[PDB]
Design a protein around this ligand. Structure first.
Ligand SMILES: [K+]
Ligand SMILES: [K+]
Ligand SMILES: [K+]
Ligand SMILES: [K+]
Ligand SMILES: [K+]
Ligand SMILES: [K+]
Ligand SMILES: [K+]
Ligand SMILES: [K+]
Ligand SMILES: [K+]
Ligand SMILES: [K+]
Ligand SMILES: [K+]
Ligand SMILES: [K+]
Ligand SMILES: [K+]
Ligand SMILES: [K+]
Ligand SMILES: [K+]
Ligand SMILES: [K+]
Ligand SMILES: [K+]
Ligand SMILES: [K+]
Ligand SMILES: [K+]
Ligand SMILES: [K+]
Ligand SMILES: [Mg+2]
Ligand SMILES: [Mg+2]
Ligand SMILES: [Mg+2]
Ligand SMILES: [Mg+2]
Ligand SMILES: [Mg+2]
Ligand SMILES: [Mg+2]
Ligand SMILES: [Mg+2]
Ligand SMILES: [Mg+2]
Ligand SMILES: [Mg+2]
Ligand SMILES: [Mg+2]
Ligand SMILES: [Mg+2]
Ligand SMILES: [Mg+2]
Ligand SMILES: [Mg+2]
Ligand SMILES: [Mg+2]
Ligand SMILES: [Mg+2]
Ligand SMILES: [Mg+2]
Ligand SMILES: [Mg+2]
Ligand SMILES: [Mg+2]
Ligand SMILES: [Mg+2]
Ligand SMILES: [Mg+2]
Ligand SMILES: [Mg+2]
Ligand SMILES: [Mg+2]
Ligand SMILES: [Mg+2]
Ligand SMILES: [Mg+2]
Ligand SMILES: [Mg+2]
Ligand SMILES: [Mg+2]
Ligand SMILES: [Mg+2]
Ligand SMILES: [Mg+2]
Ligand SMILES: [Mg+2]
Ligand SMILES: [Mg+2]
Ligand SMILES: [Mg+2]
Ligand SMILES: [Mg+2]
Ligand SMILES: [Mg+2]
Ligand SMILES: [Mg+2]
Ligand SMILES: [Zn+2]
Lengths: 129, 84, 141, 98, 149
RNA sequence: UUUUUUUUUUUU
RNA sequence: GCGGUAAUUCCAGCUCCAAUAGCGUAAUUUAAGUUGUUGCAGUUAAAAAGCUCGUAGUUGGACUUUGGGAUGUCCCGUUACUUUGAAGAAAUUAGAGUGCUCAAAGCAAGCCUACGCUCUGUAUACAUUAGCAUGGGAUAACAUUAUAGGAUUUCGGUCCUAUUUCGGGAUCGGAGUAAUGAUUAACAGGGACAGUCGGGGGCAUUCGUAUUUCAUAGUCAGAGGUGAAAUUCUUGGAUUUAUGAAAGACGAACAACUGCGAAAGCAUUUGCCAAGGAUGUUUUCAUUAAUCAAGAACGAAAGUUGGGGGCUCGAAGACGAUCAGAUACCGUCCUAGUCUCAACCAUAAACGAUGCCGACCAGGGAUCGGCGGAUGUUGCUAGGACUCCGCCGGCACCUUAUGAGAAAUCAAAGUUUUUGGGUUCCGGGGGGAGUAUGGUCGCAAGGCUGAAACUUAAAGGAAUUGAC
RNA sequence: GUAGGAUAGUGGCCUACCAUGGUGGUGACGGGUGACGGAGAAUUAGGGUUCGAUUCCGGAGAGGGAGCCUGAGAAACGGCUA
């Protein structure tokens, strides 16, 4: 059954971006998905996305810039301390110059650089570049 | 239609109608309610387009519709008007 | 596919533990069978020469490989040991005392010699290498 | 190696198909796999048609026809030359010969 | 997909986006509750009551006019059945299958279907025990299942 | 659609 | 891999190479992404249980306070997890200083020769899990919710206690206050309903030709079988012809790159009995779910025990041929069996050699079931048949690579070093071996579980060229 | 669990009476270990794998068991008793 809605959303965006589509559909919606999309959009990796209300979980349509190489979920959501971020980035990101790991900390959902800045740990949600 | 030739947020009405009721951008049924009148009786009754029961007019005790696989089949004498 | 549950550490550990036994190297060193083998987990063993034996070489070679039947002193087991180098069988006699080492492949036959896993290192307390090079002399008694 | 996508038969969405007996050797063969040919020919061979017609006992009469369904095993079908070994590309053609 | 088969059908209802009653509908919420209670007294399950209302009285959704579901209204008036309707129907099917098997020992397909139906019954009963819709002592027994219905 | 068994060891 | 009379490979001489006061030989690490959590495999290389159910275990859809004004600050139940701190023997490890002549070390030591000085130095870091304290409240887990016996203000009756009428309790009622208290209904799941559909299952019940045998009648010399024959049957009439009867199997043609079923499997009619998918639904419940150790249901053929049947074919067996032999292939006759009932057996190349659930992912034409719309005919009785356009679900097919792959190939065997959706099983070079032993099931045959000693450099997959 | 005895003292540590409890696929119980545990050692992308008799810490033993005197301290063994 559906276990990770975030995984389905990210996989749909990844497949659509690889195919070259200008838009993709995400169903169902979630606030974790919305926070992930906002983190991605903050860094210019996606365009505007629109939430559609259907009196249910909802739907999202995302504009694709063509800058997304790969976005993925990490499962299970491992515990990441402030000292494990370096190792996780080395494992997951292509380079130290670009790429982000999205974490969920008690301060909110944010990328790993902001987590280092605020010295907050949490759980790994995914990655994109 | 090619994916970049259409807008996922503004699909043409024809495509939305052609799509499965659950696969539309917002789910919407294809059923409706209708006002059915007997041939001779002025009484007017509301009937579901996909009625699963044999609706009978109280006055004359006449069957208005017959359940089927999909839409209910009205009796030949009776006529209906889309209520909505 | 693999199990990935965050609470599934026990299953992963147990599965690896069970699957380790399919590994031949792991099973050899964890079944405790090395103690029932002729050397009983030792690099060397002393023994008494019972008889000189010639072993035909395996195809496609054709030769008579000179070996000795040795009884190990510490457990009484009987093995076949190769005698290397030219004419070195002449330094071996029945009832001689020989030091035996492995053949280098950890309990497996080497080269064209079938079913031989040991070699003679010393005879009567003198290394076969010294005897071959005439550095030492085999004790008379 | 697998050489046919259908595995040499015509079974899809099905567990078991009952067999036929080869019309030549009597061997059991699944019906979906047996090479089946339907033969419709005149009872009287073309050579003897004229002689039989000249001896007709009625003013008019249409000669009957013989109907035979032949079901071969693979071995008999190849040996009798009902089918022949084809090249790797040519054996993917399913249309009957013209 | 289906719980006890390989079916992958997606046929279902498509609730309209509009949650308010249609303008042409004039019945009031207390009236709808009264008809629901009368139907329940006549011996109709909530599904049957909803079907009748939709097909005859023009009530597409009872929640739209009353603001609550049919079973909630029935419970508020002390008319909800002792055992839930779906579990009741599952038990009825199991009883029918066992009655058929009593005379057909060679019908192994019926035995397979009885196993499936009783698995469904037990899972649903466990769920209803968790939510306190059944007493903790409740237990489905094939021998005396016919008594329950 | 009668019948048709067999070819020492290594190496080129 | 060298050595079979021209040996860079053995025994030697010469020369040369590597390390060097060292070097050779005989448990364990790396290399090993060949144990794979990071991070391997399971179509054909070794590999997914025959099929389904199912408890432990693991996993589990969405939804509840956001924003601006300003300026860390003001306005509108229990845990996991993370931050910080304490504390946490030395030695060892990392590391600061220091010319034991250098170095491995050690914890020394330096200026100047002052009857001395540098308060000389002898730092610092690290430290799984678990415990202690602290800040955070995103993501998660457990518990709770509506028969109000709920929250709160006041007051009336009842039951007991203390500091100098009173305070503190512990119960029973009246009134008031309030927005009085229930997220949605997942292209999750279950259940109800409607018209259907199907070679799904069971019981009973019609039919069909053919085969064998028998009965009646006709005719006369061969019939059968083979590559060729013979065994065999035949004037006591074979074979062949017509009619009829009995018995037991088997359900042709229709019949398909079609259907149903969890699989095994399921094809003559009609009735009865329960069961089922898909479709349709503005019906119902509201997370009830996915997958699964243990444990269960079913499970071709053959086989077992005992009845009934016993047409056909036919293991075993017996003959006739062929042959060097022929315990065979071919022919002739046949026991068990083949069919059914009751009870066992539980294995098949039980195959798609390919677990289940969920998401995304190119195009096209066919086809089965259901449904929506349009349209024109029918030797028919609004319907059915046909035509066209669509939606859902299913068995498949064709083209293609922007994908994968060792390829063969695969539109799932794709979305994988840019490696992580959930979950079960299961392989680790080839043999020994599915063997020994123990256990367990079975009447038996055997099933399930299942080693080791020892042996060995390949075995093996796909594809290419040649030869045959 | 109650009441006692014993102990330097808590405690089924032992006695009398009473109750039927306690652990277990989150693997009890049983078996193997060529098993003393730790600080640590080898190898080092990271994760890991293998080792730890031996000089520091803790435990145990003095040929195998058992009992005990002296003493603040021992079930001591370069103490005694069988
Ligand atoms: K040889
Ligand atoms: K050779
Ligand atoms: K195949
Ligand atoms: K075929
Ligand atoms: K299922
Ligand atoms: K449906
Ligand atoms: K040779
Ligand atoms: K010579
Ligand atoms: K020579
Ligand atoms: K050499
Ligand atoms: K028979
Ligand atoms: K026979
Ligand atoms: K011959
Ligand atoms: K069997
Ligand atoms: K197959
Ligand atoms: K279709
Ligand atoms: K005590
Ligand atoms: K006590
Ligand atoms: K110890
Ligand atoms: K003293
Ligand atoms: Mg081949
Ligand atoms: Mg089959
Ligand atoms: Mg399931
Ligand atoms: Mg689905
Ligand atoms: Mg021969
Ligand atoms: Mg020479
Ligand atoms: Mg030389
Ligand atoms: Mg491998
Ligand atoms: Mg094979
Ligand atoms: Mg294989
Ligand atoms: Mg298999
Ligand atoms: Mg099992
Ligand atoms: Mg969630
Ligand atoms: Mg739903
Ligand atoms: Mg006849
Ligand atoms: Mg059909
Ligand atoms: Mg027929
Ligand atoms: Mg019998
Ligand atoms: Mg016969
Ligand atoms: Mg049988
Ligand atoms: Mg098997
Ligand atoms: Mg159709
Ligand atoms: Mg192996
Ligand atoms: Mg006491
Ligand atoms: Mg130690
Ligand atoms: Mg020891
Ligand atoms: Mg020592
Ligand atoms: Mg010590
Ligand atoms: Mg002691
Ligand atoms: Mg001693
Ligand atoms: Mg003693
Ligand atoms: Mg002592
Ligand atoms: Mg001593
Ligand atoms: Mg002492
Ligand atoms: Zn044939």
């Amino acid at each position: 059954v559906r276990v990770s809605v975030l995984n389905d959303a990210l996989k749909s965006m990844y497949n659509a971006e690889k195919r070259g589509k200008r838009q993709v559909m995400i169903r169902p919606s979630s606030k974790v998905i919305i926070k992930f999309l906002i983190v991605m959009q903050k860094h210019g990796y996606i365009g505007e996305f629109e939430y559609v209300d259907d009196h249910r979980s909802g739907k999202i349509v995302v504009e694709l810039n063509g800058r997304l190489n790969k976005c993925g979920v990490i499962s299970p959501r491992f515990d990441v301390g402030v000292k494990e971020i370096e190792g996780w980035t080395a494992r997951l990101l292509p380079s130290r110059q670009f790429g982000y790991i999205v974490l969920t900390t008690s301060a909110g959902i944010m990328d790993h650089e902001e987590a280092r800045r605020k010295n907050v740990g949490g759980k790994v949600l995914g990655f994109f570049y | 239609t090619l994916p970049n030739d259409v807008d996922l947020l503004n699909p043409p009405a024809e495509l939305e109608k052609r799509k499965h009721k659950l696969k539309r951008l917002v789910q919407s049924p294809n059923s409706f309610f209708m006002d059915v009148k007997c041939q001779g009786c002025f009484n007017i009754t509301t009937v579901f387009s996909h009625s699963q029961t044999v609706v009978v007019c109280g006055n004359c005790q006449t069957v208005l519709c017959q359940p089927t696989g999909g839409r209910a089949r009205l009796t030949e004498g009776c006529s209906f008007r889309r209520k909505g | 596919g693999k199990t990935r549950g965050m609470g599934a550490g026990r299953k992963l550990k147990s599965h690896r533990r069970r699957q380790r036994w399919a590994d031949k190297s792991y099973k050899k060193s964890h079944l405790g069978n090395e103690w029932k083998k002729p050397f009983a987990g030792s690099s060397h063993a002393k023994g008494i020469v019972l008889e000189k034996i010639g072993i035909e070489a395996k195809q496609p070679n054709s030769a008579i490989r000179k070996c000795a039947r040795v009884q190990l002193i510490k457990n009484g087991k009987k093995i076949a040991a190769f005698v290397p180098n030219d004419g070195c069988l002449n330094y071996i006699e029945e009832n001689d005392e020989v030091l035996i080492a492995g053949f280098g492949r950890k309990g497996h036959a080497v080269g064209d010699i079938p079913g031989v896993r040991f070699k003679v290192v010393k005879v009567s307390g003198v290394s076969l290498l010294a005897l071959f090079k005439e550095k030492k002399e085999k004790p008379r008694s | 190696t697998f050489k046919r996508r259908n595995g040499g038969r015509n079974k899809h969405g099905r567990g078991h198909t009952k067999f036929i007996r080869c019309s030549n050797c009597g061997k059991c063969c699944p019906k979906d796999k047996a090479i089946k040919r339907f033969l419709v020919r005149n009872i009287v061979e073309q050579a003897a048609v004229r002689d039989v017609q000249e001896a007709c006992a009625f003013e008019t009469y249409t000669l009957p026809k013989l109907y035979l369904k032949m079901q071969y095993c693979v071995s008999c079908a190849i040996h009798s030359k009902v089918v022949r070994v084809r090249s790797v590309t040519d054996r993917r053609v399913r249309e009957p010969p013209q | 997909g289906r719980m006890h088969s390989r079916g992958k059908g997606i046929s279902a209802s498509a609730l309209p986006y509009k949650r308010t009653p249609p303008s042409w509908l004039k019945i009031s919420a207390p009236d709808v509750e009264d008809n629901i209670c009368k139907f329940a007294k006549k011996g109709l399950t909530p599904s049957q009551i909803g079907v009748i209302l939709r097909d005859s009285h023009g009530i597409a959704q009872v929640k739209s006019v009353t603001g609550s579901k049919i079973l909630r209204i029935l419970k508020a008036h002390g008319l909800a059945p002792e055992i839930p309707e779906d579990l009741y129907h599952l038990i009825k099917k199991a009883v029918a299958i066992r009655k058929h098997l009593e005379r057909n020992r060679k019908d192994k397909d019926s035995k397979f279907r009885l196993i499936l139906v009783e698995s469904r019954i037990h899972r649903l009963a466990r769920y209803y025990k968790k939510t306190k819709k059944l007493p903790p002592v409740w237990k489905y027994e094939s021998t005396t299942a016919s008594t329950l219905v």
